[PDB]
Amino acid sequence: SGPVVATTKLVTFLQRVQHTALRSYPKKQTPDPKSYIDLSLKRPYSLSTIESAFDDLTSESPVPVETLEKFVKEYFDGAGEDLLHHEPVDFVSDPSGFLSNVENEEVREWAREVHGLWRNLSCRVSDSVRESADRHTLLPLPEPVIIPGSRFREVYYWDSYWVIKGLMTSQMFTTAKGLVTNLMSLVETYGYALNGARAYYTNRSQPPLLSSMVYEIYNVTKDEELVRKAIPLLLKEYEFWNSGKHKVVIRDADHVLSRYYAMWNKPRPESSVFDEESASGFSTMLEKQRFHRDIATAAESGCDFSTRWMRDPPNFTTMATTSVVPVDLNVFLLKMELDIAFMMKVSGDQNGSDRFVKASKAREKAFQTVFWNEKAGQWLDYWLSETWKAENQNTNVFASNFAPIWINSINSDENLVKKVVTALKNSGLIAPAGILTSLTNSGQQWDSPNGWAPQQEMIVTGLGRSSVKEAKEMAEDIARRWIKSNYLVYKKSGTIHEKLKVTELGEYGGGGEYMPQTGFGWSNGVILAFLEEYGWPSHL
Ligand code: NA
Numbered sequence: 450s451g452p453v454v455a456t457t458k459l460v461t462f463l464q465r466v467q468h469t470a471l472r473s474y475p476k477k478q479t480p481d482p483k484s485y486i487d488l489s490l491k492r493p494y495s496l497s498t499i500e501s502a503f504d505d506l507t508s509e510s511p512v513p514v515e516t517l518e519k520f521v522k523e524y525f526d527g528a529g530e531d532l533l534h535h536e537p538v539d540f541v542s543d544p545s546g547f548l549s550n551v552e553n554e555e556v557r558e559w560a561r562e563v564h565g566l567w568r569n570l571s572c573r574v575s576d577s578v579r580e581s582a583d584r585h586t587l588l589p590l591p592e593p594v595i596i597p598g599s600r601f602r603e604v605y606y607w608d609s610y611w612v613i614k615g616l617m618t619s620q621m622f623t624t625a626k627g628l629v630t631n632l633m634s635l636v637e638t639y640g641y642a643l644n645g646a647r648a649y650y651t652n653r654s655q656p657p658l659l660s661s662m663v664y665e666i667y668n669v670t671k672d673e674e675l676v677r678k679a680i681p682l683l684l685k686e687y688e689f690w691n692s693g694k695h696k697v698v699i700r701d702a703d704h705v706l707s708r709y710y711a712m713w714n715k716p717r718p719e720s721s722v723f724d725e726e727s728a729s730g731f732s733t734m735l736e737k738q739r740f741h742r743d744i745a746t747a748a749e750s751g752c753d754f755s756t757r758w759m760r761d762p763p764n765f766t767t768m769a770t771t772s773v774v775p776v777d778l779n780v781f782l783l784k785m786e787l788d789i790a791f792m793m794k795v796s797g798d799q800n801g802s803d804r805f806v807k808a809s810k811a812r813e814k815a816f817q818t819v820f821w822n823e824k825a826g827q828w829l830d831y832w833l834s835e836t837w838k839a840e841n842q843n844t845n846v847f848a849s850n851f852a853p854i855w856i857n858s859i860n861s862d863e864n865l866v867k868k869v870v871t872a873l874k875n876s877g878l879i880a881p882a883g884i885l886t887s888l889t890n891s892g893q894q895w896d897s898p899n900g901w902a903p904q905q906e907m908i909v910t911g912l913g914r915s916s917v918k919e920a921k922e923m924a925e926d927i928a929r930r931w932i933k934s935n936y937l938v939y940k941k942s943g944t945i946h947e948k949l950k951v952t953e954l955g956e957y958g959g960g961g962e963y964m965p966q967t968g969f970g971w972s973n974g975v976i977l978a979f980l981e982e983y984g985w986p987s988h989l
């Protein structure tokens with residue numbers, strides 16, 4: 450029903466290689482399918498040449514594993530080989546003043562190792578990608594990047610916000626602005642920031658944190674040229690989220706709100722084989738396409754995957770993301786309206802600034818009417834069937850149900866904060882190492898027993914900005930629990946993880962279609978962000 454943004458024939462040929470690859474290997478020896486979509490064509494061969502050779506090699510119906518592997522190393526450069534290390538111009542081993550507020554000498558010295566990992570995550574798109582981009586699925590980019598880590602060998606959209614928060618702590622403002630410049634280039638080329646900087650991501654976006662990245666950088670550097678460039682591109686991205694399939698209207702007892710909606714109704718190329726098997730239970734092609742669109746839409750939500758998006762959890766195949774008006778998404782567009790109104794006021798466009806002020810107040814009242822649940826003491830996703838109805842609220846408990854606390858008109862409301870503090874301390878989401886993303890152990894990675902850095906930060910930051918003392922103490926307690934568990938994990942394995950098993954201190958999290966991943970961009974950023982805000986006493 451919705452549009453479908455086509456991918457490049459390089460991507461579609463690499464899916465052929467991937468499908469051949471995972472048929473050939475034994476079941477437990479299944480490789481990561483993404484390492485195939487991340488290949489690039491080895492010079493001087495062309496695509497047609499490589500495809501002809503592949504067609505000759507595959508004229509027999511599986512392929513011997515050793516024959517396949519020989520083809521891979523002959524015609525392709527490995528995954529990540531077109532992504533080269535880059536020494537950030539603004540990196541310094543120990544920055545002057547870095548976490549100077551952190552008394553505990555052991556905590557601060559660990560944090561400087563964490564800060565040292567910006568060098569590992571720092572890399573740059575090779576000159577082949579810029580000169581002959583048709584040979585790569587890596588997209589070309591104006592500036593060096595910070596990647597999440599490990600299998601995520603490209604820059605991602607919403608990761609970069611919490612990365613940028615850490616880069617500020619690390620005093621790496623040029624690297625931080627380089628990420629924003631890269632992301633603005635994607636808005637300019639495509640009209641929206643891609644899920645990540647790969648050709649198989651041109652069909653969808655991610656939670657829209659661009660305006661927050663520009664804001665947090667401006668708030669420190671007061672770079673008025675960055676704001677002036679950003680405004681036309683943010684106006685574009687705001688248009689993208691409030692029109693087309695992304696816009697929904699909910700009439701009350703009319704509010705314009707947004708939903709995720711990927712422009713894709715096929716197996717995700719990076720996971721093509723897995724998605725095809727996931728959908729094999731549907732009998733018609735329309736049912737497969739609707740399911741694939743909800744899978745891809747869950748990818749665009751950033752939370753792939755969770756019982757949050759399942760119509761009948763924990764059944765993966767009831768994934769229904771396009772039916773969900775999500776709390777956190779509309780938190781981020783409320784922020785977008787506050788951010789643009791600020792940047793227009795600052796750049797001498799008080800007329801535009803008032804448009805977005807009224808925008809923000811309409812969404813603030815959509816929040817109370819549509820998402821808020823007084824009896825729950827939290828905000829709830831609204832599931833579509835249009836006009837509102839109480840049973841359409843998803844009453845299950847998620848950390849994203851508490852994301853509005855991040856918003857200043859919310860956390861400035863002393864009475865609201867108190868209702869939210871109690872609802873959250875009684876929710877059961879608070880766990881030994883931080884905040885559980887949900888209460889259902891589903892085997893997915895965005896579910897219990899896991900907790901996630903971006904959700905820790907939004908709640909801690911929000912609670913900490915209130916004037917309510919119990920919120921402020923709960924916020925610090927969560928941050929220290931998160932920091933501690935990340936320290937224990939780091940001492941055990943020498944790395945920082947994508948997500949934590951917050952049910953146990955010192956344990957990283959797993960689940961989902963791929964193995965636990967390390968680096969890890971927003972995890973490092975939140976650790977540094979929390980330490981800059983709260984410090985660590987030497988007596989602790
Ligand atoms: Na994600």
